[PDB]
Symmetry: C2
């Protein structure tokens, strides 16, 4: 059941402005819920504040599209 | 498991240009696959050809977003 959800997560994150790919995604089931941790690429010339905004937008987009996700941490790396 | 998928189907169809709501949706599991039949509302002043285009765009959008769907029939009604 996980591969389909992971695809949806990647797809949803990569649609958000400022995301330069999903570098890392670890998702696991906690019962019927998904808990996930993600790293996104961002432009090295974005400010840290902008990167933080992009992370927050990813969290909103992904959580909004995939209802079973109950925890999602997003961080950023220069790419 | 079905309610989540039906939500995704409605949501995906209602995002397509020219769709004036999902009037009817019957979805059923055939094993792990979904087979569905849908009626969408359309502007009574669209041509039949335009309605046919909108139906085809709905089928593409829904099938593209929901991988488990293996059959989807879409028709249109004036609304
Ligand atoms: Cu903030
Ligand atoms: Cu045609």
């Amino acid at each position: 059941h996980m591969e389909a959800v992971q695809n949806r997560i990647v797809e949803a994150a990569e649609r958000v402005p400022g995301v330069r790919g999903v570098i890392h995604l670890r998702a696991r089931y906690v019962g019927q819920d998904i808990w996930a941790n993600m790293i996104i690429g961002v432009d090295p010339e974005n400010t840290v504040e902008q990167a933080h905004e992009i992370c927050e937008a990813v969290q909103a987009a992904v959580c909004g599209k995939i209802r079973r996700i109950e925890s999602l941490h997003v961080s950023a790396e220069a790419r």
